[PDB]
């Protein structure tokens, strides 16, 4: 079973039907997090350390989850009512790092 890490993901806005409002870009590299948070190095909270230790003693309690722990912004173009271009910075759009939470 593969452990917690980032994985590539290109988001094509036309595939998600967001090309009806996003003038630019046509998509972007968002990435995603995936993998096991095993008992035996990863970025984790004290809670994630505890839940992981509890899980190693009782399986009915799930392991910590592999989620984005460092994200970055992107800028996109849309149109206002007047068909004028508006630039906006969307926060936490790209995964820079994964961790167990």
């Amino acid at each position: 079973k593969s452990s917690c890490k980032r994985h590539p993901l290109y988001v094509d806005f036309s595939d998600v039907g967001w090309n009806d409002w996003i003038v630019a870009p046509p998509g972007y590299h968002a990435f995603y997090c995936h993998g096991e948070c095993p008992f035996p190095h990863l970025n984790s909270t004290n809670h994630a350390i505890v839940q992981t230790l509890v899980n190693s003693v009782n399986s009915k309690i799930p392991k910590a989850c592999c989620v984005p722990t460092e994200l970055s912004a992107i800028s996109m173009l849309y149109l206002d009512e007047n068909e004028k271009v508006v630039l906006k910075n969307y926060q936490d759009m790209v995964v820079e790092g994964c961790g167990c939470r």
Binding site: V16, W18, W21, Y78, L79, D80, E81, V86, K88, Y90
Partner: protein, 56 residues
């Protein structure tokens, strides 16, 4: 400005095709002020997706 947060909390509390219809109008009202809103543009897609599954 953009009021999809108010439309969402109002639908989420009801759920805990009569609530979806009320949420479809709400988002269409604030639509002008939600022109560059990511949470709105997902809501339009979200509402549309539940009008087909379950169909009503």
């Amino acid at each position: 400005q953009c009021r999809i947060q108010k439309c969402t909390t109002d639908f989420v509390s009801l759920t805990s095709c009569k609530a979806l219809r009320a949420y479809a109008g709400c988002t269409q009202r604030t639509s002008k002020a939600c022109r560059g809103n990511l949470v709105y543009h997902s809501a339009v897609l979200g509402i549309s997706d539940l009008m087909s599954q379950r169909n009503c």
